Amino acid sequence: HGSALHWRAAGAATVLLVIVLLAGSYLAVLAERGAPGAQLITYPRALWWACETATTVXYGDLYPVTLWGRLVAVVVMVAGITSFGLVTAALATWFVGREQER
Amino acid sequence: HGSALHWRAAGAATVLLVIVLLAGSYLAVLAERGAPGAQLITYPRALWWACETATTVXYGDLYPVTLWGRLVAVVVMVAGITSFGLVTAALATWFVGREQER
Amino acid sequence: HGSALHWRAAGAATVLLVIVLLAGSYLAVLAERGAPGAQLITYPRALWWACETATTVXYGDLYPVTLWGRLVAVVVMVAGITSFGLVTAALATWFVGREQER
Amino acid sequence: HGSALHWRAAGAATVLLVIVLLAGSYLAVLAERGAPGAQLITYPRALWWACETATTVXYGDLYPVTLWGRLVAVVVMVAGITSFGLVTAALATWFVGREQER
Amino acid sequence: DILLTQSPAILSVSPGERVSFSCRASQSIGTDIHWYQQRTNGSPRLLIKYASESISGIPSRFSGSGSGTDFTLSINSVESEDIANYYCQQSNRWPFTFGSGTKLE
Amino acid sequence: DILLTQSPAILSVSPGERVSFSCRASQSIGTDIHWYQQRTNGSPRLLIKYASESISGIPSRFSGSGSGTDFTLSINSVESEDIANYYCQQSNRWPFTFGSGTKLE
Ligand SMILES: CCCCCCCCCO
Ligand SMILES: CCCCCCCCCO
Ligand SMILES: CCCCCCCCCO
Ligand SMILES: CCCCCCCCCO
Ligand SMILES: [K+]
Ligand SMILES: [K+]
Ligand SMILES: [K+]
Ligand SMILES: [K+]
Numbered sequence A, B, C, D: 001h002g003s004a005l006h007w008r009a010a011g012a013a014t015v016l017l018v019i020v021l022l023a024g025s026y027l028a029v030l031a032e033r034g035a036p037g038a039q040l041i042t043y044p045r046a047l048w049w050a051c052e053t054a055t056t057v058x059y060g061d062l063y064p065v066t067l068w069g070r071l072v073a074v075v076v077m078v079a080g081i082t083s084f085g086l087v088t089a090a091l092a093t094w095f096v097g098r099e100q101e102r
Numbered sequence E, F: 001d002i003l004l005t006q007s008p009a010i011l012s013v014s015p016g017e018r019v020s021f022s023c024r025a026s027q028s029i030g031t032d033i034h035w036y037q038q039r040t041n042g043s044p045r046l047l048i049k050y051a052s053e054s055i056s057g058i059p060s061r062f063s064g065s066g067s068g069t070d071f072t073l074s075i076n077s078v079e080s081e082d083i084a085n086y087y088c089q090q091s092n093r094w095p096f097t098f099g100s101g102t103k104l105e
C-alpha cells in the first residue's frame, strides 16, 4: 500500500479521533458521577461535550469538575487539535506537490 | 483555468462555508423549535451562533440542545475548521514557492 | 528589502492584528452602547474581549448583542484566525527550507 | 545533534508550553487574589484553567478579572496557539519530505 | 443537591376530570425530569421521560410538560387504575434525586 | 462578598443521636466549603474539606454533604468530646469568608 503518507495519517487521525470521542464520553461519565453538582453524567450529552471539546468550541453548557474528568478533557482537546492539525498539514502537502506540477 | 489549485480550493471553501452558515442557521432553528427551553430559535441570532461556532469561539450565549441541532452544530464546526485550515495550507504553499524563487 | 516573504507577511499580520484589536475595542463599545443589557460598553474590558475573540477562547464573560457589535466581532475572529494561520504557514516554510539543507 | 529542526522546535515548544501552564497557574492566582469576586484563586483549578486557555476551549467556568490576570491569560493563549501551530508546521514538513521520496 | 418539591401531597379529583401533578426543582434542570407511578404494594413504573417524552405501554392520557424549574404531569380523564403515588426524578446533576410524591384520589 | 449563614446558632442533642449543622451560602459555591472545630480556649481544627472529603485523624463519625448553596456537617452518635463551636468557610471566591458558627450542646 503506497498511497500518500499524509492521507493515510489523516485517515488514521480521524478514526482515532472518533475512538477518543467515544472513549472520552464513557470515561468522563465514569469520572464525574460521584461528584455533587456534576452535569457531565449521562452518555448522550457527554458525547456532545466531547465533540465541542475536541473542536475547542466549549460553549460552557457542559464541563468536567473532577480531576479525572478534566484529565480526560485534556486528552480530548489534544487529540482533537492534533487531528485537525494533521489534516491541515496533509492539505498543505497536497497543494505543494500540485503547485510544482502546475 | 490554470490558476493555482490552493487558491481555487480556498475560494471554494469560503463560498461553501458561507452556504453552511446560512443552511446551518436555517436547519438549527428548524431543529430547536419544539424543544422547551431552547434559545436557538430565531434566524438572525442563529446566523450569529453559526459564525461563532464555525470559528470555534463559542461564547455560550447560544447553543443547541436537541440531537439534530447538535448534529447541525458539528457540521458547522468541521466545515469552519476545515475551511480555515485550507486557507492556512494555501498560505503555506504560497510562501514555500516564493521562498524557492527568493 | 529581500528578507523572506513569509516573515514579512507574518510581521504585517501581527501589526494589523494589534490595529484590529484596538479598533475592534473602540467600535464594539460604540456599537453596544444604546442597547439595554449590553455589557461590552467600556474600553478596557472591550480590549480584553477582543483578545479572547481573536484567539477564539471566548470565555463568555463578555460578548456583543447588537448587529454591528457582532459584525465587529466577526472581523476580529477572522483577523485573529488568519493572523495565527499566517504565522503557522511561515513556520512551515522555514522548517521546509531548513530540512532541504539538512 | 543533527536531528530534524522541525521536531526539535516542536519538542521545545511542548516543554515551554508545560512551563507556561505551570507559571501561568502560579501567576494568575497571585494576580487574582485581592480582587472581590475572583474565582481563579486556587492552584489546582488554575492549572485546569490554563489548559483550556492554552487550547482555546474556554468553557467559561473560570476566567481572570484583573488586568494582570488577563495579561497572564493572553500569554497562555499565544503560547498555546503558537505551540500547536508549530506542531502542525512540523507535521507538514514531515509529510512534504516523505511525499518527495514516495 | 437538587431538591424536588411535589405539592400538594394529595390530589382529590372526580372520575373523568383532568388532573395535574406539580414538581418543582430548587434550580434549573432543563427537561431532565422523569415521572414514575407506584401502585399499592407495587414497584415504581416509568410514565414519562425527559419531561414530555412518552413511553410505550403507557396510556395516551398521560402527558408531561414544563422546563427549567417547574414541571407538570397530566392525566386526561382520570380513571380508577390511575389511583397511585406519583414521583418525579431529576437526572441533571449528581446525585439523582426523587420528589416526595403526590397521591391521587 | 460571600455570606455564609449558620442556623441555628445552638444545637442541643442527646448523647448518642445524629446531629446536623447547617451552612448556607448567599450564592452557588460548588463544593468549596470547609468545616472547622474549635473547643473552649483552643485553636480551630479542620474536620472536612471540600464539603465531603475526610481528614486523617478525624473520627469516622464526622461526615459532610451538600453542593451549591446548602451544606451539612453531620456527626453520627454525638459524644462529649464533640462539644465545641463549628464553623464553615468558603474558598470559591475572594475573599475567603467564615460562617458565624454553631455551638453543640
Ligand atoms: C484517563 C481516563 C481515566 C478514567 C478514570 C475514571 C476515574 C475514576 C473515579 O474515581
Ligand atoms: C443535518 C440537518 C438536519 C436538520 C433536521 C431538522 C430536525 C427535525 C426535527 O424533528
Ligand atoms: C464595522 C464597524 C462599524 C461600527 C459601527 C457602529 C454602529 C453604530 C450603532 O448605530
Ligand atoms: C506577567 C505576569 C505578572 C504577574 C504579576 C502579578 C500581579 C500582581 C498584583 O498586584
Ligand atoms: K472556544
Ligand atoms: K464559553
Ligand atoms: K477555540
Ligand atoms: K468558548
Ligand SMILES: [K+]
Binding pocket: A059, A060, A061, B059, B060, B061, C059, C060, C061, D059, D060, D061
Ligand atoms: K458561559
Ligand SMILES: [K+]
Binding pocket: none
Ligand atoms: K486552529
